[PDB]
Amino acid sequence: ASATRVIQKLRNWASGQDLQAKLQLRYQEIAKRTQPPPKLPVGPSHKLSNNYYCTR
Amino acid sequence: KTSFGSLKDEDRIFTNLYGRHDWRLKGALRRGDWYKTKEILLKGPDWILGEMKTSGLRGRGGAGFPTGLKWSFMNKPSDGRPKYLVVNADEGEPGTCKDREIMRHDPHKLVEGCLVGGRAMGARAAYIYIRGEFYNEASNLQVAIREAYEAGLIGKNACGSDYDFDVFVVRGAGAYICGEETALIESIEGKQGKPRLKPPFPADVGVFGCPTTVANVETVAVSPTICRRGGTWFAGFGRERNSGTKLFNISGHVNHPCTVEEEMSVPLKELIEKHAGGVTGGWDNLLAVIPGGSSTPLIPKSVCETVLMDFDALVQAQTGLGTAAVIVMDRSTDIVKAIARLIEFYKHESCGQCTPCREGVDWMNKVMARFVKGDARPAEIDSLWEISKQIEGHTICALGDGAAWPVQGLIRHFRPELEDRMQRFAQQHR
Numbered sequence A: 001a002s003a004t005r006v007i008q009k010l011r012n013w014a015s016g017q018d019l020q021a022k023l024q025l026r027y028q029e030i031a032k033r034t035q036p037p038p039k040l041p042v043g044p045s046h047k048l049s050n051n052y053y054c055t056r
Numbered sequence B: 001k002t003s004f005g006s007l008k009d010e011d012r013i014f015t016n017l018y019g020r021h022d023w024r025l026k027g028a029l030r031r032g033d034w035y036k037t038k039e040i041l042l043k044g045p046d047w048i049l050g051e052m053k054t055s056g057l058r059g060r061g062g063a064g065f066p067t068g069l070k071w072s073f074m075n076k077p078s079d080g081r082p083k084y085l086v087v088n089a090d091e092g093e094p095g096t097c098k099d100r101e102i103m104r105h106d107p108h109k110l111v112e113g114c115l116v117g118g119r120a121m122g123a124r125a126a127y128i129y130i131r132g133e134f135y136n137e138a139s140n141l142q143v144a145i146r147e148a149y150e151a152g153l154i155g156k157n158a159c160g161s162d163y164d165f166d167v168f169v170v171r172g173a174g175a176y177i178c179g180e181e182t183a184l185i186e187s188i189e190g191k192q193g194k195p196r197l198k199p200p201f202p203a204d205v206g207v208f209g210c211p212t213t214v215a216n217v218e219t220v221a222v223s224p225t226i227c228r229r230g231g232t233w234f235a236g237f238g239r240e241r242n243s244g245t246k247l248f249n250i251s252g253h254v255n256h257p258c259t260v261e262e263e264m265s266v267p268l269k270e271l272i273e274k275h276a277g278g279v280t281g282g283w284d285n286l287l288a289v290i291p292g293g294s295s296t297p298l299i300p301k302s303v304c305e306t307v308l309m310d311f312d313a314l315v316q317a318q319t320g321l322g323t324a325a326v327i328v329m330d331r332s333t334d335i336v337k338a339i340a341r342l343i344e345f346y347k348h349e350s351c352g353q354c355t356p357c358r359e360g361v362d363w364m365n366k367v368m369a370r371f372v373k374g375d376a377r378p379a380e381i382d383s384l385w386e387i388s389k390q391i392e393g394h395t396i397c398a399l400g401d402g403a404a405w406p407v408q409g410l411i412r413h414f415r416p417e418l419e420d421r422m423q424r425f426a427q428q429h430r
């Protein structure tokens, strides 16, 4: 992403593809390495009634 | 007949219910006890059992089982073991004082009934297991028994009928579970008050491993009057299959809480408005009624308008007639708190032998305390219903059923009250 415009035009002409739109090196678009804590949902059997195991 | 109630004083059995006459032998003989009891005993076992059967008397204990069939379960030839009549005089159940009243006021009726039932079933003795807290009642019972022994009504010549019968009085030591049949048998035998499983039934293996029959004080006390006046009269009182008179203990939010004797199938509204002086604040101020002691569920005012006081009528009303203990709660009653206090009673009075009643009744007590505080969510209502259904029918004795039924009644009728308490708690905390 630090390539000069001359080298970018040279690479794009040599490959035939617009390489700068789809770079194979990740710079900033990736997720942050620290994330907010999750709160995972519970399954369908997490209920206090009508949940006898013989019926499922 | 179609309408029942308005029992006449000449037809009331317990003529000294209020202690206004002499409770001793002279007053009892003036009131008509111990009359032709020798002739009854010479008529013998089969005639007495037929009289009970044609009277159609059902168990005043709260079980509701027929008395004639239950007593004819012991109409068998002896296999060398002695046979025993055992009289449930514990009266542990809340709301109920009728056995106390008739023990301290008509004890000679109880003694004569012990003799009649023991002769009918074939028995050398009747052990009256009285409640441990009823010390004065037990002492009055012993005074009456000493009078009967001195008069020759009891002991080695039962009123001169060449029949030997002894009446013992054994005091409990404070356990509601000892009012149960088999637990009472164990308590007499000297162990803890833990009910034993059936089979064997007590008519086969009971107290001291002998054939025995446990019967309520009211049942035993109305036995000799039934024999004297015939079973057709007692069957003529009450509805079909719910026959005779009954001692009702009306307590709670009524103007005159009292013990009265009234015919079976009396309307509940009629009984309250006639003998209890009505609900405090009026029939519109009535909220709920527990009609058969704590073991029966509650019924709201809407079905209390027209319900009768029968076993079958209360079964149709999704209740039971237990000890005929009518506990009345008005609009100011914290109904959830009252039911939780009942569940706390059952938690303190469980004998702890068997797992569903032990663990589940403690669990239901904790859940009901949180319901009173509002500290739950409405899914726990259905959870508590399922816990009650797991307790009911899975226990050794019927204390589990008698603890599951009030919870079921509260959930069945006053569910929006529980949801409103939970919502108010939730909005006042969050």
Ligand SMILES: Cc1cc2nc3c(=O)[nH]c(=O)nc-3n(C[C@H](O)[C@H](O)[C@H](O)COP(=O)(O)O)c2cc1C
Binding pocket: B058, B059, B060, B061, B062, B063, B064, B065, B066, B067, B070, B088, B089, B090, B091, B092, B093, B176, B177, B178, B179, B180, B181, B214, B215, B216, B217, B219, B397, B398, B399, B402
């Ligand atoms: C937990 C429990 C407690 C009971 N407490 C009493 C009691 O205090 N007095 C009583 O007469 N019956 C009590 N009973 C009911 C007895 O089963 C009943 O009295 C006994 O079977 C006598 O039968 P009857 O109703 O035909 O006279 C209790 C039952 C249970 C399950």
Ligand code: SF4
Binding pocket: B177, B194, B195, B349, B350, B351, B352, B353, B354, B355, B357, B358, B395, B396, B397, B398, B399, B400
């Ligand atoms: S139900 Fe309760 S009181 Fe009855 S035997 Fe079981 S533990 Fe004892």
